[PDB]
A paper describes a structure:
CK1δ is a Ser/Thr-specific protein kinase and is one of seven mammalian CK1 isoforms (α, β, γ1, γ2, γ3, δ and ε) within the CK1 family. All CK1 isoforms share a highly conserved kinase domain and phosphorylate a high number of substrates, including the tumor suppressor protein p53. Based on the wide spectrum of substrate proteins CK1 family members play an important role in the diverse signaling pathways that are involved in cell division, apoptosis, membrane transport, immune response and inflammation, spindle and centrosome-associated processes, DNA damage-related signal transduction and circadian rhythm. Deregulation and dysfunction of CK1 isoforms are associated with proliferative disorders, such as cancer.
For this, a C-terminally truncated version of CK1δ (1-294, tCK1δ) together with 29d and 29e, respectively, were used in co-crystallization trials. Crystals suitable for diffraction analysis grew in presence of both compounds in crystallization conditions containing 0.1 M MES (pH = 5.5), 10% polyethylengylcol (PEG) 4000 and 0.2 M Li2SO4. These crystals diffracted to a resolution limit of 1.8 Å and belong to the monoclinic crystal system. In each asymmetric unit, two tCK1 molecules were present with an isoxazole-based ligand bound to each ATP binding pocket. Surprisingly, the ligands in both protein-ligand complexes proved to be different from the actual target compounds submitted to co-crystallization. Since all analytical data for the originally employed inhibitors was consistent with the given structures, we postulate that the incorporation of an additional methylene group occurred via spontaneous Pictet-Spengler cyclization during crystallization. Following the discovery of new ligands as artefacts in the X-ray complexes, both these Pictet-Spengler products 31a and 31b were re-synthesized and subsequently assessed for their biological activities. In the in-vitro kinase assays both compounds exhibited nanomolar activity against CK1δ and CK1ε with a five-fold preference for CK1δ over CK1ε. The cellular assays revealed 31a and 31b to be more potent than the originally designed compounds 29d and 29e with EC50 values below 2 µM. The higher cellular potency of both compounds is in a way surprising, because in contrast to compounds 29d and 29e the chiral moieties of the Pictet-Spengler products 31a and 31b are too far away to interact with residues in the ATP binding site.
Author numbering: 3 to 18, 21 to 43, 47 to 292
The structure:
Amino acid sequence: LRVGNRYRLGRKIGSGGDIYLGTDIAAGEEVAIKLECVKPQLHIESKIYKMMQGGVGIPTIRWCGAEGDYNVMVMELLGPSLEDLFNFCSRKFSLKTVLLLADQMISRIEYIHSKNFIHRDVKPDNFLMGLGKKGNLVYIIDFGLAKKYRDARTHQHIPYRENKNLTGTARYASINTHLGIEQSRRDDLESLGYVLMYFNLGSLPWQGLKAATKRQKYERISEKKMSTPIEVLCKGYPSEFATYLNFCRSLRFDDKPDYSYLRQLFRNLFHRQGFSYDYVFDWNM
Ligand SMILES: COc1ccc(-c2cc(C(=O)Nc3cc(-c4c(-c5ccc(F)cc5)noc4C(C)C)ccn3)n3c2CN2C[C@H](O)[C@H](O)[C@H]2C3)cc1
């Protein structure tokens, strides 16, 4: 079974809505292939990927097209997601690994923002480690929910609006996203703050809530998230994680985040440990 007369389809390797391992027959290396039934967001997403190409940690798209009952996108092969690796590490990351990940993840989000888009679904499942020579590089994937937030030429910001439906993953959504406020740059970074504390804790305190329908469940998540102060969420971990989250929640809708300040919070903590720290992630030790 071939895709584009040139890619051999292999076994399924995930879903993000089905991801297959593939082989570039001509070049002889493996690839990742995403197939979508013609119902649609793959072609729109491919254009965003191609707008982002060249950035550090942005995957390369090898081919786009249609094959029978599927729209197809072929991407360079990447490794397991950070969720996969978190589970492999028994849902415990060392502080070193969390700080190493935080530095790269802030930079990936900054790059997307520099290209005039907001990601709007920041979660561990959308960060993948490279393979082989790129095993120390964090990649970001999935622009199916991404949105342009400013004009490319003038940088004029999209307007503030409310009554927006939740586009993303409830567990990691910002408070203002739960309130139905238009997402902006601050919300990508606030979601990352929850991801980092997720890595620190093994789970977040608004996980595991049940309800009749999705809407009621999101309301339960919203209530618990709003009633858990950052100081309680982050107790027992270096204060930098609370400082990060408080900074993100204090950003105005239109504010350009101080990415450098946020990276330096964690970089200073990392460097203060001196030689007691490596540049080796837990799963490579
Ligand atoms: C021999 O050594 C090896 C070999 C392979 C691996 C290897 C490679 C992968 C993998 O998923 N790669 C991958 C996935 C995507 C991808 C896409 C996507 C694909 C194409 C496209 F155009 C746009 C998006 N959308 O979503 C995903 C993720 C979330 C699934 C993109 C690029 N790369 N996984 C493994 C290892 N596995 C362990 C566990 O079982 C995981 O589930 C599975 C994941 C590790 C070691």
